[PDB]
Amino acid sequence: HTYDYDYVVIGGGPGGMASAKEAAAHGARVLLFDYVKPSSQGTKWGIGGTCVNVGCVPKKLMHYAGHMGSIFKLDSKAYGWKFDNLKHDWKKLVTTVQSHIRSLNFSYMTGLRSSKVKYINGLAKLKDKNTVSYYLKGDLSKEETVTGKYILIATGCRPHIPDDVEGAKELSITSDDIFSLKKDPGKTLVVGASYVALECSGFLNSLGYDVTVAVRSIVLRGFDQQCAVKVKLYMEEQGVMFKNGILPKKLTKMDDKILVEFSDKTSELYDTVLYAIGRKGDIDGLNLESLNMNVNKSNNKIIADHLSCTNIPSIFAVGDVAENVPELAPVAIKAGEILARRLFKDSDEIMDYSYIPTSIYTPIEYGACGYSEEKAYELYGKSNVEVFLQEFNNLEISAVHRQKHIRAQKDEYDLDVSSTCLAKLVCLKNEDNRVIGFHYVGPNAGEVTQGMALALRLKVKKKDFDNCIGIHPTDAESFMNLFVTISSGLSYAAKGGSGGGKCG
Amino acid sequence: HTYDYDYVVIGGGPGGMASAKEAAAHGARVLLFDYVKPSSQGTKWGIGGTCVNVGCVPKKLMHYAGHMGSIFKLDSKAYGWKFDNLKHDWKKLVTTVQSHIRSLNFSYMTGLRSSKVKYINGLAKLKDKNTVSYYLKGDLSKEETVTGKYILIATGCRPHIPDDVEGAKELSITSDDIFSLKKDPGKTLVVGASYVALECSGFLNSLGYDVTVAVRSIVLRGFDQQCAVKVKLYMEEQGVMFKNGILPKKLTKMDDKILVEFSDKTSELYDTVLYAIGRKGDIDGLNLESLNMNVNKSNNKIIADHLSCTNIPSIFAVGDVAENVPELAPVAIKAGEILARRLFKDSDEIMDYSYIPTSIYTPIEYGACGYSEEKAYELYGKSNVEVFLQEFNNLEISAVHRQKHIRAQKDEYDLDVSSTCLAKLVCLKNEDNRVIGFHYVGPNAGEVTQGMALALRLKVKKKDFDNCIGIHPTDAESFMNLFVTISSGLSYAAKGGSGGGKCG
Amino acid sequence: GSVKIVTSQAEFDSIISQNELVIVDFFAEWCGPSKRIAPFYEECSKTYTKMVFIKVDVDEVSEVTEKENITSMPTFKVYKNGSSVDTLLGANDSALKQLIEKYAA
Amino acid sequence: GSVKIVTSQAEFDSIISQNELVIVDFFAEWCGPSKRIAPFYEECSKTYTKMVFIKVDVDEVSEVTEKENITSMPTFKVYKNGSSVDTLLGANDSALKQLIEKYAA
Ligand SMILES: Cc1cc2nc3c(=O)[nH]c(=O)nc-3n(C[C@H](O)[C@H](O)[C@H](O)COP(=O)(O)OP(=O)(O)OC[C@H]3O[C@@H](n4cnc5c(N)ncnc54)[C@H](O)[C@@H]3O)c2cc1C
Ligand SMILES: Cc1cc2nc3c(=O)[nH]c(=O)nc-3n(C[C@H](O)[C@H](O)[C@H](O)COP(=O)(O)OP(=O)(O)OC[C@H]3O[C@@H](n4cnc5c(N)ncnc54)[C@H](O)[C@@H]3O)c2cc1C
């Protein structure tokens, strides 16, 4: 048989672009499609997928904006800085963020061109197990078609706004909208408690907005909960309010504001409602029905195996749209690359999804790698795992003696903030204390965790941490003298500081 | 034989305190002496040694002060923050820093007491191979004496001001003085190019002072020089001036200012001269002559072997005062603790000085662990080591498009700053690319390097870095896709950004 | 009556032994919380005259602290003829008031 | 004469082929340096009339850029009857002026 291309890929995000460029560098003739269907509110953007335009990159940028603000308001006076009339301009932040996104759009495009990948800005679906139909620039007037030996689906995900909430789909924004919004966010309700909800609440609050979070149940489901509470508490003590167990039941457009009726029958007025409860695979307009490709219909994700194969032998899926794969850009890149090598370089490396490091950018950050405490217990038995841990205060913040925001003040004496950091290692007693879980809450968690994720990958034992010299004064060195265990019962609370309204 | 104590230790810094507390916890009766002989300018402080009072702790605190300032001046406007009349108050900074040091003084003292260590604030020397003479509160009226089965010398180091420079010892301050100074530092000349010189120049500059650094030959002597130049260049592009190859020859007191005659015969007026050329072991008033204990007289450091033994079988040395041991607090702690266990717990662990991580806190930080590129060549052969490396820009700073300070502007078009970061791995070709050197220049270097030092300790190979998933968007992840080598000749320069007066 | 600053172990010992009922406030000048409750403690020295009110700077009067086993600030200890009988920790005014009436209302 | 914005590949092709001597300024709205030199380039369109001055937004007119091999901004290319003969990169006014007099003084 003969085809127009050796590799046609649907989606120009981290995974699609990475797989295309690897495939090309091994001789494959490659075609890639990317098209951005507008969001609930009509927001659109350039090439690069979720990560560059409406995810990791702009999220990190505004986190910086917010973190900066917290430094001004909480710490600067203590360190000797004086200033007048501190105000934040949202419009300027957005334009600084979009300018940068637009520069990455260009660069990702010229990179495809350098690697000899043909890119077409067109909406795509498949007509056949080796055929893809498309529509230049969204325009459904002319369907054109192309064939490929192998098809890769890498369309990723979009945010889900629930059906059972009146006015939700119509009035609320999502992560697709927040980073380019034309109006100041103002009084904002964020609905959800995933890392995306908490990260947007966080920077919006630090930026100066009144921010409320609606949490059915718990925060950061899936993640180690001691750390989750630590993050939650820190946000609370800076201003953000958590409506626990109380979700919106109805939204009504009401001039330049939105009224939200809650499941406890209360009601309140907001400038912005931001839905961030989850994301579904973007799969609907792909015509996968007409190939009988099995997909998990709750997720809306493609069921692909450990080689990125669907049940159709010539079509593959990687990244956010494949079920059971972590929604992290570097993960979609590795899988896209490994796939390309397996298809066009006779490689036999298979993608390893274990011990994938993660890092959440809340106003106090959380990085992890491996099992939570709770899960290591279930999987291995509580009597068979050691948890070494330690709360402590960051040096720089410690010296400021920050105070709780009023809303977190129990009585007029509850002033000092809680300890800022936590370091926790989860270990397998019966394997010489092999560390099978790493958790760190504190500043710069992404930076701290990377090297540690590498150590976990090398099967590091607790003794190896103890024998490594720590770098002083640093947040990370806390891991290198971590001797208080959960089983021992001894206090793991912050030693010293003006904690608890007493210097000790 | 019988003694008053099983362990008498001279010095209350990281090493002496750590060794004392371990020894105590294993049954030893322990006595510890600490006394602070005032500095060239009469500065004194509490217990804890160099680290807590006039080293790592206050240095990190003011680095924060400065870093903060750089954020206000260079980045804040870009991220949407507006303010009026930004000025820094030096007096306030100093009081916030000293309040904190004073709280750590207290806590280090109550810690000794908890561990059952008797502490005497007294000047000490040894009368005998098992006897120590001392003087309560410095007062040389009554010499009292005490005996010990084993003596530990842990007196550390003080800054050296050279003899051959007229007015130097008399007029210039050191690191003992900078963190408590009563006058604004004003126009400051820093002499030396060690990590201490560069760190003080850095924060002082960021704080807003006109700062000049005199360097005979190279900067950050003893460290990887590609990274050294990177740090130097970054400081230059923020305002600090480097008088290369030009040291002071004479200093003359002149009202509230100081005139400095330079070896090129030029001369200039400064508010402060800060000598930071090195540190000598504080050994002189110890009477070690009268035991014939061998010391390296250039260093003024005690010659101790791999077990912390001197040539006198009952006296030991650890920390800054022992020759050939890195002047890092955690290092002095580990050696102090290991010693105590060897003396009082029949342990046979010996202290490992290889692959010790270090991190320098210049306005752009540098962390490293293992061999420099230059040294790995000498030791192993240039054709036998691979250097993978990559310059790149921090995401958050990237989006600001900072501009060079005027003084670093070649022509009126030389505006964009150089690339901010560098990641470099030094590897042994003939050992499956075992990484024997780690170097990272950029923000938060201490936090990045810790985990990576642990990986080096586990004998990580380059392939292990490549198989680890990176955390995005982070500075550290640049290590996990590092494929450009020195030998290949390909460009390792920052890809993209608006440097070189063109974006792309 | 009011609050005085003690500056010697002998003075602390002499004042408590001879005076029967005594409260003492162990403070640190660098201690935020200790400062936070200093005014209120001055107040109680006036109102509740059925007790002696005094202060000890834990850095200045080193010997005293290394004996009463002071490990945090502010620490309040109450005495009877010379022997400690109760001890409170923290800058919670309500707690302190609650403590003083317990032995001096 | 002055500077105009081209918004199609055919228009770019037609204008250069038929007009002989042409300089073109490939810019990006989000590009700092490109903006930095935009005024000065407007100036040269007036002074040096021995050439045609035009602009191309590299994001809008996608097809053009993916052919002239534009990989950074601002990029200046000069043409003769229809064929590129020189090409400059950067926001250095002196360089640009130096370039224009080379072919149009
Ligand atoms: C708010 C938020 C924050 C995040 N933060 C982080 C973070 O800090 N760190 C991190 O590692 N990850 C983060 N992520 C995750 C990251 O964004 C994604 O995991 C990553 O983009 C995955 O790559 P992908 O190839 O699987 O999918 P995508 O990046 O989503 O690529 C999908 C592309 O497919 C397109 N498409 C769909 N249908 C068609 C069609 N018919 N034709 C053509 N194109 C089509 C889409 O428009 C899109 O461009 C974040 C995500 C969100 C939403
Ligand atoms: C400016 C500066 C910045 C630094 N920054 C860092 C950093 O960021 N990170 C890091 O890991 N390290 C840093 N260091 C190094 C670190 O401070 C030292 O390595 C560490 O303190 C060593 O402790 P020590 O036990 O070896 O001796 P010391 O800390 O020097 O303590 C010894 C004590 O002995 C006392 N002494 C001397 N003679 C007598 C005597 N006869 N009687 C009684 N007492 C005596 C001294 O007063 C001193 O208190 C820095 C050093 C300096 C100068």
PDB file of all heavy atoms in Angstrom, chain A residues 23-43:
ATOM      1  N   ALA A  23       9.420  11.886  14.696  1.00  0.00           N
ATOM      2  CA  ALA A  23       9.129  11.081  13.506  1.00  0.00           C
ATOM      3  C   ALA A  23       9.831  11.616  12.259  1.00  0.00           C
ATOM      4  O   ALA A  23      10.479  10.859  11.539  1.00  0.00           O
ATOM      5  CB  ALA A  23       7.632  10.998  13.268  1.00  0.00           C
ATOM      6  N   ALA A  24       9.692  12.916  12.006  1.00  0.00           N
ATOM      7  CA  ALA A  24      10.410  13.602  10.928  1.00  0.00           C
ATOM      8  C   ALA A  24      11.926  13.391  10.967  1.00  0.00           C
ATOM      9  O   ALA A  24      12.550  13.131   9.943  1.00  0.00           O
ATOM     10  CB  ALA A  24      10.114  15.068  10.977  1.00  0.00           C
ATOM     11  N   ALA A  25      12.526  13.514  12.146  1.00  0.00           N
ATOM     12  CA  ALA A  25      13.975  13.387  12.276  1.00  0.00           C
ATOM     13  C   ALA A  25      14.459  11.963  12.027  1.00  0.00           C
ATOM     14  O   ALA A  25      15.650  11.711  12.020  1.00  0.00           O
ATOM     15  CB  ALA A  25      14.419  13.847  13.643  1.00  0.00           C
ATOM     16  N   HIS A  26      13.535  11.026  11.845  1.00  0.00           N
ATOM     17  CA  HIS A  26      13.907   9.650  11.517  1.00  0.00           C
ATOM     18  C   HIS A  26      13.484   9.238  10.107  1.00  0.00           C
ATOM     19  O   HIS A  26      13.451   8.049   9.780  1.00  0.00           O
ATOM     20  CB  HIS A  26      13.306   8.680  12.527  1.00  0.00           C
ATOM     21  CG  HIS A  26      13.878   8.811  13.897  1.00  0.00           C
ATOM     22  ND1 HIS A  26      15.207   9.095  14.117  1.00  0.00           N
ATOM     23  CD2 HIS A  26      13.303   8.711  15.115  1.00  0.00           C
ATOM     24  CE1 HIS A  26      15.428   9.154  15.420  1.00  0.00           C
ATOM     25  NE2 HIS A  26      14.289   8.925  16.047  1.00  0.00           N
ATOM     26  N   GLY A  27      13.147  10.222   9.280  1.00  0.00           N
ATOM     27  CA  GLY A  27      12.862   9.974   7.876  1.00  0.00           C
ATOM     28  C   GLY A  27      11.405  10.042   7.460  1.00  0.00           C
ATOM     29  O   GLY A  27      11.110  10.127   6.265  1.00  0.00           O
ATOM     30  N   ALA A  28      10.497  10.011   8.428  1.00  0.00           N
ATOM     31  CA  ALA A  28       9.071  10.003   8.123  1.00  0.00           C
ATOM     32  C   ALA A  28       8.632  11.299   7.478  1.00  0.00           C
ATOM     33  O   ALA A  28       9.114  12.377   7.836  1.00  0.00           O
ATOM     34  CB  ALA A  28       8.258   9.748   9.373  1.00  0.00           C
ATOM     35  N   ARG A  29       7.738  11.172   6.505  1.00  0.00           N
ATOM     36  CA  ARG A  29       7.056  12.314   5.936  1.00  0.00           C
ATOM     37  C   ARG A  29       5.903  12.575   6.879  1.00  0.00           C
ATOM     38  O   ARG A  29       5.111  11.667   7.145  1.00  0.00           O
ATOM     39  CB  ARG A  29       6.510  11.974   4.544  1.00  0.00           C
ATOM     40  CG  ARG A  29       7.560  11.510   3.512  1.00  0.00           C
ATOM     41  CD  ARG A  29       6.888  10.881   2.266  1.00  0.00           C
ATOM     42  NE  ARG A  29       6.130   9.680   2.635  1.00  0.00           N
ATOM     43  CZ  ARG A  29       5.204   9.099   1.879  1.00  0.00           C
ATOM     44  NH1 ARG A  29       4.904   9.594   0.676  1.00  0.00           N
ATOM     45  NH2 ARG A  29       4.569   8.023   2.337  1.00  0.00           N
ATOM     46  N   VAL A  30       5.805  13.798   7.391  1.00  0.00           N
ATOM     47  CA  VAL A  30       4.885  14.072   8.489  1.00  0.00           C
ATOM     48  C   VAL A  30       3.954  15.236   8.198  1.00  0.00           C
ATOM     49  O   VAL A  30       4.385  16.283   7.710  1.00  0.00           O
ATOM     50  CB  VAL A  30       5.652  14.371   9.786  1.00  0.00           C
ATOM     51  CG1 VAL A  30       4.696  14.644  10.938  1.00  0.00           C
ATOM     52  CG2 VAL A  30       6.563  13.217  10.134  1.00  0.00           C
ATOM     53  N   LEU A  31       2.675  15.053   8.506  1.00  0.00           N
ATOM     54  CA  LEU A  31       1.719  16.141   8.419  1.00  0.00           C
ATOM     55  C   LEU A  31       1.070  16.319   9.782  1.00  0.00           C
ATOM     56  O   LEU A  31       0.696  15.337  10.420  1.00  0.00           O
ATOM     57  CB  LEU A  31       0.652  15.809   7.384  1.00  0.00           C
ATOM     58  CG  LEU A  31      -0.507  16.801   7.252  1.00  0.00           C
ATOM     59  CD1 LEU A  31       0.003  18.176   6.838  1.00  0.00           C
ATOM     60  CD2 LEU A  31      -1.541  16.280   6.260  1.00  0.00           C
ATOM     61  N   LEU A  32       0.907  17.558  10.226  1.00  0.00           N
ATOM     62  CA  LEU A  32       0.292  17.784  11.526  1.00  0.00           C
ATOM     63  C   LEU A  32      -0.834  18.785  11.398  1.00  0.00           C
ATOM     64  O   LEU A  32      -0.682  19.822  10.730  1.00  0.00           O
ATOM     65  CB  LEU A  32       1.334  18.281  12.549  1.00  0.00           C
ATOM     66  CG  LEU A  32       0.875  18.602  13.976  1.00  0.00           C
ATOM     67  CD1 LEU A  32       1.994  18.247  14.946  1.00  0.00           C
ATOM     68  CD2 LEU A  32       0.508  20.075  14.114  1.00  0.00           C
ATOM     69  N   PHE A  33      -1.949  18.488  12.057  1.00  0.00           N
ATOM     70  CA  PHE A  33      -3.073  19.403  12.070  1.00  0.00           C
ATOM     71  C   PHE A  33      -3.243  20.006  13.439  1.00  0.00           C
ATOM     72  O   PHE A  33      -3.166  19.297  14.427  1.00  0.00           O
ATOM     73  CB  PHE A  33      -4.352  18.665  11.699  1.00  0.00           C
ATOM     74  CG  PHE A  33      -4.386  18.196  10.283  1.00  0.00           C
ATOM     75  CD1 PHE A  33      -4.133  16.868   9.975  1.00  0.00           C
ATOM     76  CD2 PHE A  33      -4.666  19.079   9.261  1.00  0.00           C
ATOM     77  CE1 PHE A  33      -4.160  16.431   8.663  1.00  0.00           C
ATOM     78  CE2 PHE A  33      -4.693  18.654   7.956  1.00  0.00           C
ATOM     79  CZ  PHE A  33      -4.442  17.326   7.655  1.00  0.00           C
ATOM     80  N   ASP A  34      -3.495  21.307  13.499  1.00  0.00           N
ATOM     81  CA  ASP A  34      -3.947  21.904  14.744  1.00  0.00           C
ATOM     82  C   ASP A  34      -4.999  22.973  14.494  1.00  0.00           C
ATOM     83  O   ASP A  34      -4.833  23.834  13.618  1.00  0.00           O
ATOM     84  CB  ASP A  34      -2.761  22.486  15.530  1.00  0.00           C
ATOM     85  CG  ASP A  34      -3.150  22.929  16.922  1.00  0.00           C
ATOM     86  OD1 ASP A  34      -3.289  22.064  17.804  1.00  0.00           O
ATOM     87  OD2 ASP A  34      -3.338  24.142  17.128  1.00  0.00           O
ATOM     88  N   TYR A  35      -6.077  22.923  15.275  1.00  0.00           N
ATOM     89  CA  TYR A  35      -7.145  23.927  15.186  1.00  0.00           C
ATOM     90  C   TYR A  35      -7.787  24.162  16.543  1.00  0.00           C
ATOM     91  O   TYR A  35      -8.070  23.215  17.280  1.00  0.00           O
ATOM     92  CB  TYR A  35      -8.220  23.499  14.184  1.00  0.00           C
ATOM     93  CG  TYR A  35      -9.271  24.565  13.933  1.00  0.00           C
ATOM     94  CD1 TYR A  35      -9.022  25.626  13.058  1.00  0.00           C
ATOM     95  CD2 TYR A  35     -10.510  24.510  14.564  1.00  0.00           C
ATOM     96  CE1 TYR A  35      -9.978  26.602  12.819  1.00  0.00           C
ATOM     97  CE2 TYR A  35     -11.472  25.488  14.336  1.00  0.00           C
ATOM     98  CZ  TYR A  35     -11.202  26.528  13.464  1.00  0.00           C
ATOM     99  OH  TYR A  35     -12.163  27.492  13.242  1.00  0.00           O
ATOM    100  N   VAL A  36      -8.023  25.422  16.874  1.00  0.00           N
ATOM    101  CA  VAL A  36      -8.541  25.743  18.189  1.00  0.00           C
ATOM    102  C   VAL A  36     -10.013  26.087  18.114  1.00  0.00           C
ATOM    103  O   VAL A  36     -10.371  27.200  17.726  1.00  0.00           O
ATOM    104  CB  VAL A  36      -7.779  26.939  18.827  1.00  0.00           C
ATOM    105  CG1 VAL A  36      -8.286  27.194  20.236  1.00  0.00           C
ATOM    106  CG2 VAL A  36      -6.279  26.672  18.846  1.00  0.00           C
ATOM    107  N   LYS A  37     -10.866  25.136  18.477  1.00  0.00           N
ATOM    108  CA  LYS A  37     -12.287  25.434  18.582  1.00  0.00           C
ATOM    109  C   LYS A  37     -12.453  26.358  19.785  1.00  0.00           C
ATOM    110  O   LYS A  37     -11.977  26.037  20.879  1.00  0.00           O
ATOM    111  CB  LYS A  37     -13.103  24.156  18.786  1.00  0.00           C
ATOM    112  CG  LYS A  37     -12.656  22.979  17.954  1.00  0.00           C
ATOM    113  CD  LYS A  37     -13.693  21.856  17.969  1.00  0.00           C
ATOM    114  CE  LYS A  37     -13.414  20.834  19.043  1.00  0.00           C
ATOM    115  NZ  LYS A  37     -12.074  20.206  18.865  1.00  0.00           N
ATOM    116  N   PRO A  38     -13.110  27.513  19.591  1.00  0.00           N
ATOM    117  CA  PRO A  38     -13.352  28.498  20.658  1.00  0.00           C
ATOM    118  C   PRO A  38     -13.960  27.911  21.935  1.00  0.00           C
ATOM    119  O   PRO A  38     -14.521  26.818  21.927  1.00  0.00           O
ATOM    120  CB  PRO A  38     -14.320  29.479  20.003  1.00  0.00           C
ATOM    121  CG  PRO A  38     -13.913  29.456  18.559  1.00  0.00           C
ATOM    122  CD  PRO A  38     -13.547  28.015  18.274  1.00  0.00           C
ATOM    123  N   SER A  39     -13.827  28.633  23.037  1.00  0.00           N
ATOM    124  CA  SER A  39     -14.254  28.118  24.328  1.00  0.00           C
ATOM    125  C   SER A  39     -15.694  28.516  24.531  1.00  0.00           C
ATOM    126  O   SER A  39     -16.218  29.284  23.727  1.00  0.00           O
ATOM    127  CB  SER A  39     -13.418  28.736  25.442  1.00  0.00           C
ATOM    128  OG  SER A  39     -13.657  30.143  25.534  1.00  0.00           O
ATOM    129  N   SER A  40     -16.308  28.016  25.609  1.00  0.00           N
ATOM    130  CA  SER A  40     -17.655  28.410  26.042  1.00  0.00           C
ATOM    131  C   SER A  40     -17.927  29.897  25.831  1.00  0.00           C
ATOM    132  O   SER A  40     -19.034  30.287  25.466  1.00  0.00           O
ATOM    133  CB  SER A  40     -17.859  28.085  27.528  1.00  0.00           C
ATOM    134  OG  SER A  40     -17.361  26.802  27.857  1.00  0.00           O
ATOM    135  N   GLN A  41     -16.910  30.724  26.054  1.00  0.00           N
ATOM    136  CA  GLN A  41     -17.067  32.170  25.949  1.00  0.00           C
ATOM    137  C   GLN A  41     -16.452  32.738  24.669  1.00  0.00           C
ATOM    138  O   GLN A  41     -16.385  33.949  24.492  1.00  0.00           O
ATOM    139  CB  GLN A  41     -16.457  32.856  27.177  1.00  0.00           C
ATOM    140  CG  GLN A  41     -16.895  32.250  28.498  1.00  0.00           C
ATOM    141  CD  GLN A  41     -18.372  32.475  28.795  1.00  0.00           C
ATOM    142  OE1 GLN A  41     -18.926  33.526  28.450  1.00  0.00           O
ATOM    143  NE2 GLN A  41     -19.015  31.489  29.450  1.00  0.00           N
ATOM    144  N   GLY A  42     -15.994  31.864  23.780  1.00  0.00           N
ATOM    145  CA  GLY A  42     -15.508  32.305  22.484  1.00  0.00           C
ATOM    146  C   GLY A  42     -14.038  32.684  22.428  1.00  0.00           C
ATOM    147  O   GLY A  42     -13.587  33.314  21.465  1.00  0.00           O
ATOM    148  N   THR A  43     -13.283  32.300  23.452  1.00  0.00           N
ATOM    149  CA  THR A  43     -11.850  32.572  23.488  1.00  0.00           C
ATOM    150  C   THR A  43     -11.077  31.630  22.548  1.00  0.00           C
ATOM    151  O   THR A  43     -11.344  30.427  22.518  1.00  0.00           O
ATOM    152  CB  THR A  43     -11.327  32.352  24.909  1.00  0.00           C
ATOM    153  OG1 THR A  43     -12.201  33.004  25.845  1.00  0.00           O
ATOM    154  CG2 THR A  43      -9.910  32.868  25.056  1.00  0.00           C
TER     155      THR A  43
END
